[PDB]
Amino acid sequence: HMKYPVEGGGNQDWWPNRLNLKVLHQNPAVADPMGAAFDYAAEVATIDVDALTRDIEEVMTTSQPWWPADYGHYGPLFIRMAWHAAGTYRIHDGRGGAGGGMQRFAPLNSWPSNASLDKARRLLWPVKKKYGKKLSWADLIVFAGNCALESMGFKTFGFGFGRVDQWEPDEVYWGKEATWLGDERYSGKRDLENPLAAVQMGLIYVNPEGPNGNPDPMAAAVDIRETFRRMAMNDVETAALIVGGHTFGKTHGAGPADLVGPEPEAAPLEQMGLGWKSSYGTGTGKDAITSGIEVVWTNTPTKWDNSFLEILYGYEWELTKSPAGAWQYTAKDGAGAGTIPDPFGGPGRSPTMLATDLSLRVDPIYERITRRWLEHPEELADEFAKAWYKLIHRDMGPVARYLGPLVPKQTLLWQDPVPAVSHDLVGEAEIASLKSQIRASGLTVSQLVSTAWAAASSFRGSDKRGGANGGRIRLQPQVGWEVNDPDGDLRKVIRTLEEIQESFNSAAPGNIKVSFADLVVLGGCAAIEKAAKAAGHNITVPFTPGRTDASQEQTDVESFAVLEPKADGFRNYLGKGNPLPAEYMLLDKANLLTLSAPEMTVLVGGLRVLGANYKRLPLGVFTEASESLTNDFFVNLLDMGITWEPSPADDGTYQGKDGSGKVKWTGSRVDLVFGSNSELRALVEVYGADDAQPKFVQDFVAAWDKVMNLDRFDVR
Amino acid sequence: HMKYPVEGGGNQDWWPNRLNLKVLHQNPAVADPMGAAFDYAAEVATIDVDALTRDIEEVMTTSQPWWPADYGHYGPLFIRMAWHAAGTYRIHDGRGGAGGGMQRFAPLNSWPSNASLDKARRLLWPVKKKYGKKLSWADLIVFAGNCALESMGFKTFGFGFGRVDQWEPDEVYWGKEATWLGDERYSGKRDLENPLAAVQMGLIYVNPEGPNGNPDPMAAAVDIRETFRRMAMNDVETAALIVGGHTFGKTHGAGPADLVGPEPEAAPLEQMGLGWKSSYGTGTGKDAITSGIEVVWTNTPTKWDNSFLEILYGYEWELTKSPAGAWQYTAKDGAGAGTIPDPFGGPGRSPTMLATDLSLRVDPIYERITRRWLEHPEELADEFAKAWYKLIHRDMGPVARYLGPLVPKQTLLWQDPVPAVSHDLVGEAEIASLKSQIRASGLTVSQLVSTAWAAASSFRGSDKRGGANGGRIRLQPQVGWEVNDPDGDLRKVIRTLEEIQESFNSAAPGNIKVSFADLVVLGGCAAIEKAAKAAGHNITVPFTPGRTDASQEQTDVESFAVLEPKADGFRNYLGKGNPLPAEYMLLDKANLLTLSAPEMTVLVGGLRVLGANYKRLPLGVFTEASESLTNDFFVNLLDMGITWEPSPADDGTYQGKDGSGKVKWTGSRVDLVFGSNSELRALVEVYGADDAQPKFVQDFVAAWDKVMNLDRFDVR
Numbered sequence A, B: 001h002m003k004y005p006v007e008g009g010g011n012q013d014w015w016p017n018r019l020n021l022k023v024l025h026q027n028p029a030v031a032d033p034m035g036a037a038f039d040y041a042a043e044v045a046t047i048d049v050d051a052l053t054r055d056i057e058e059v060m061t062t063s064q065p066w067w068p069a070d071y072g073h074y075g076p077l078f079i080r081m082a083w084h085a086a087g088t089y090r091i092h093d094g095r096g097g098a099g100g101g102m103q104r105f106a107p108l109n110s111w112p113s114n115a116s117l118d119k120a121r122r123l124l125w126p127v128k129k130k131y132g133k134k135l136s137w138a139d140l141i142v143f144a145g146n147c148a149l150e151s152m153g154f155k156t157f158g159f160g161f162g163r164v165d166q167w168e169p170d171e172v173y174w175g176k177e178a179t180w181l182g183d184e185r186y187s188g189k190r191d192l193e194n195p196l197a198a199v200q201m202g203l204i205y206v207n208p209e210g211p212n213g214n215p216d217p218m219a220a221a222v223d224i225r226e227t228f229r230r231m232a233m234n235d236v237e238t239a240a241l242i243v244g245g246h247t248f249g250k251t252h253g254a255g256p257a258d259l260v261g262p263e264p265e266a267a268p269l270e271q272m273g274l275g276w277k278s279s280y281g282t283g284t285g286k287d288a289i290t291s292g293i294e295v296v297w298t299n300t301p302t303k304w305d306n307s308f309l310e311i312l313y314g315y316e317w318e319l320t321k322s323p324a325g326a327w328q329y330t331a332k333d334g335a336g337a338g339t340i341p342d343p344f345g346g347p348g349r350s351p352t353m354l355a356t357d358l359s360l361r362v363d364p365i366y367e368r369i370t371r372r373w374l375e376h377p378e379e380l381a382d383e384f385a386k387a388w389y390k391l392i393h394r395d396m397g398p399v400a401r402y403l404g405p406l407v408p409k410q411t412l413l414w415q416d417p418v419p420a421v422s423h424d425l426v427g428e429a430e431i432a433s434l435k436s437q438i439r440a441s442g443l444t445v446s447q448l449v450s451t452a453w454a455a456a457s458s459f460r461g462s463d464k465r466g467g468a469n470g471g472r473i474r475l476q477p478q479v480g481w482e483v484n485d486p487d488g489d490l491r492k493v494i495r496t497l498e499e500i501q502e503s504f505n506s507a508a509p510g511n512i513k514v515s516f517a518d519l520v521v522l523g524g525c526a527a528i529e530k531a532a533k534a535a536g537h538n539i540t541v542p543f544t545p546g547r548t549d550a551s552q553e554q555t556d557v558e559s560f561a562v563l564e565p566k567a568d569g570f571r572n573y574l575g576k577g578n579p580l581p582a583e584y585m586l587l588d589k590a591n592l593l594t595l596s597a598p599e600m601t602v603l604v605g606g607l608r609v610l611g612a613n614y615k616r617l618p619l620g621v622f623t624e625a626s627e628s629l630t631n632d633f634f635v636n637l638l639d640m641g642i643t644w645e646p647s648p649a650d651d652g653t654y655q656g657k658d659g660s661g662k663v664k665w666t667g668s669r670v671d672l673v674f675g676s677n678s679e680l681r682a683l684v685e686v687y688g689a690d691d692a693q694p695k696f697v698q699d700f701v702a703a704w705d706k707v708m709n710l711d712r713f714d715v716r
């Protein structure tokens, strides 16, 4: 049954797997109530942090009747809240994470693992109310967690504000399963489907009752190890994170799970966007039901100390069931009876642990890490500080974006740092001079453009890693990436740009210097200025200097792995192992570059004729002109005098012939989608009209400049 | 199975009937390749119309191998094209129509009834190519049809350019049926579901083989009568349209319908956005297969004459079947054998008609109209001209919008015309003076604001009918509309404004005058300036004079019926017979006002406290203040100190109580959705913060001013 648009119906219902260009217009300006002048960086730098901290530290100790506070302190709940907000991150595509406060929107707000955090978010309204424009929910949600930690005795490594709120949810592939807590994502031995980073649909990392509900610690550890790995956490960081978290607070499963109402997005209006309404007892506090598990890890649930580990090794564990029928461990032979305080004044309870908590003692690598901390709790405190910090800042992008008086100076490898400007910067005259020098270097328009795109286009906008700043194109791994093709030139191109760097720098007027990283981008710009004149157009391509050159030591090769493009329609590259065909991988790539459909479109057309393609293949190259910047791609794409068919050599390519029956052009799926898809073709008709050529060049230059500048938060 | 976003997956899949705010951000700026400076009106006024016309005439006579031209002329095909582009229009919501050139996007590009028009659109590319930015496809598609008519000997009444192209499809409820050509839309005797205007899913009006494939002319007529009626056509207009159209061209069904490939949106990339590829013979021209019916109405298929009616009455008709097995009539006893020319040089054929063509002779009302024109073909010509003109211009809005040197001066009733400015206009000092006079009039902030909103908010953005210009609030039917509530005041308000109109006008300085229509809007603005100070805020509400006062003679009461709000969340009105609950009807209304979510939101929260509601009901009115302009609505909507439940008196309302158990607020679905829905609540938190109040006022004014000015194409 097709439905009203206002109820969700549309063209996706008629052609289930059509290309959805709505990924190229998420969070549109028109749905943003702040208006165009709004600059959060400027707002949030007026915020009195101290007052905010204290305003938060009051909300924590001021219980509220509609969700009373465990042990008269919401801190632990907030820590969980923040950990869940940041804990959706995954390294494969850099999406998830706390960076856009997405936990307040669907689907995340209604994930089973985020049960009860609806009420946690609500409790902070009085803080938001007070601070308004100057404080994003995104910053608030994780700052609350960081304040909770400090409040209850744990001194963190620091904090950074900057996270800009958005107004419609970021749409993200979370898995194929159409049922909450479902599993259709493993294959082979236990290989987790790429790009997911959770073991079941609706969870953060793993199942707290062990794999598929099976409470075997040893196995659970394999799931922990691997999911946490896919959120950028190695064994140490992972163990630090779990013990540190579970040093505070408790689970909730005081009665049957079937007396819990529907999730927020499916709840009735009177609940005011809150869900999971419990008819068991008071439904809250004492009778709270969040996970279904009823554990309290430590006997100091609102203080920081070594209790968690002391208790983990200090007892022997056996399987039991919570009052809701979920697995958990409690201590053998009624040991530690009544040593654990009740959240609301009741009598004491026995020690308890999750299945997954036992993983930290049973798994041999984790045993070794946690035993060590059993006797050296200060190594724990330190490791938890670093990993917590990393956790809630992983998607913040370059350091430049980190704001506030709580940001520490120290450089961290995982931030993919770049050096500070150490010299003066090239002015107009030196830029102009350097462009000439590059044009005479003997490097072709194709080489220069390819190399510039290679480096800059490594940026992804999800976690804002990658980009041309750093000059990492010449380091491992970027330099040896198939798509960047070391077997092609590249090394020839690098060498030549290093020679020009040194020459300019040896003869520089006084104290101006230029980085390698700036020259790579500058080369492309020059090359494009050259191809503009070759097409009888005179323009200057804008260029913003400032990039600095990282070194191999300051570049984590392993972490850079996830940015290797396994596909890039802008160079007609298509590797193996992509989850959908080429036209969809093109769009997702455009998404990751923050590009709009117009922008995506101009770049493809421009890039092709400039000779940007992988191995310089002829695919898409609809021009007779050599390294000239024309709209030829478009004009030829709309030539009905040409007839397209799959290549006989059935290889994902197409042959376009004329009246004479001779192949005239070749193209791939990525090329032809622009003339097939009715929305994209519309755009091609703008850029392929007879009056279109100046506009094509202008917009192409603007889009190119946009990609070059993507990671340049240092000047914004 | 949940899918990747880029393949269509999203939150709609998890909660099938959730509120889709994407109706309030259609055709976003970021996906428009023209840029912000683009002004079609200024582009299209540079177009040389004569050259365009000749450029189009050349395309019509220049056949192309991939779809050769019937009788060496594409005119008829373009007429059909244009008629289908305009012929999706429906009066109930004023959506469909030619105004946004939506035929080139999904779903319309792939409707069955639009089969072959993919190729018809493609033929015009050379025209668009040449004209570029100065000509929308929207204007081109219908203009082509208009040029085809003139070219083949029919002088039309005129034409207006102005249709601005869009870049993503307008999403519109076309019916519930999940199958092409399906029928789940009739009930009772044969009541067609509101708001549809076609008998089956994917058709324009009716089935050319008669109701549900049953070739009974008498019955078909009932469908024709009523579908055409719902596209604003009476019996005369309707018969004129059919005979006029079918004077030209032919149908296509030369072989089996199962040898026709999939529709455009489901076709493979190599077809370049074309569909219905036919393996029957050459697949085109002689072997063309469009509808499956093989009729050629007249023996002069590329000239305008009275052949159609001469043939209809000149013969006796019997059932037969096209080579593809569809129903049609041909002439009895081998009469007129070989008198009808073949589209590609073949031997002649017998006379033929559609089932729905025979309706025009069999139905008694149609028989009377068409018999008359059998002998008076000039009455036909005249009627066809007026009805065609109306057809392709119905959604163009106020006359101001109509551009180009081919627009005739003559006023038409169906355009809901307003008079020309006949006097000078009030300047700053008379505006300011008139505001004070209104403030002293003894009319309350509630009355003034209600009335303004009542008139202005009659605008729907789909066909751009309605609005405050015309001053039709005081005329039938707008004055006697339940929601406008004549039983309320209104008449008191009108009278008082007419008095102030005359007073100012009798004492005007020289030759300045003010219309009633301007005062209604000016009132509301004053009222709001008043409530701004009452809330300790000093602002001037912008106001744009120029509206003129229509009369009852110049106001088609019947046609204004479809604009009666059957719901309006902005005044908490909710009539009966709406298709979905109140919160959805709110959004759809916001869509019709061209409002964004931020805009919709500020208005509701402003309007409530100003006392805008239907019967001044207390619902939503979350303020202690009387006719004051505060954000109170928001602040109170986010008070957790209040607990909401349905009203015991189960009447679609809600009671919100405090700690004391006493009802403190009441609200409806429309009110509470703003605190339930996670996206809307996010907006509410902007406007409820402590720093929010200035911004609330500013944006509220901007949004109010935007609704006042909706129909003011006379100043844009």
Ligand code: HEM
Residues within 6 Å of the ligand: A070, A075, A076, A077, A079, A080, A083, A205, A206, A207, A208, A224, A241, A242, A244, A245, A246, A248, A249, A250, A251, A252, A253, A289, A290, A291, A292, A293, A356
């Ligand atoms: C193996 C990884 C983890 C698993 C399987 C896990 C599972 C859980 C579960 C099921 C709950 C109970 C939710 C409820 O029903 O109330 C919980 C609570 C909690 N978690 Fe974890 N968690 C993990 C890691 C973490 C991490 C990394 C942190 C933070 C660094 C953390 C901090 C907390 C805190 C403070 C609570 C207490 C909630 C309250 O006081 O109301 N957990 N965890």
Ligand code: HEM
Residues within 6 Å of the ligand: B070, B076, B077, B078, B079, B080, B083, B116, B205, B206, B207, B208, B224, B241, B242, B244, B245, B246, B248, B249, B250, B251, B252, B253, B289, B290, B291, B292, B293, B354, B356
């Ligand atoms: C009772 C309402 C109508 C019905 C049932 C109807 C049906 C049809 C059908 C089914 C075709 C076959 C398309 C093909 O096989 O190529 C056709 C052709 C055509 N129709 Fe109508 N139509 C209606 C109203 C109109 C109107 C209002 C016009 C415009 C005034 C019109 C103009 C045309 C023209 C010009 C063609 C010939 C196209 C060509 O030569 O390729 N029709 N009609």
Ligand SMILES: OC[C@H]1O[C@H](O)[C@H](O)[C@@H](O)[C@@H]1O
Residues within 6 Å of the ligand: A419, A422, A423, A505, A513, A514, A515, A516, A547, A548, A549
């Ligand atoms: O960012 C680093 C680069 O620029 C600096 O100005 C140095 O002089 C140069 O040696 C270095 O390669």
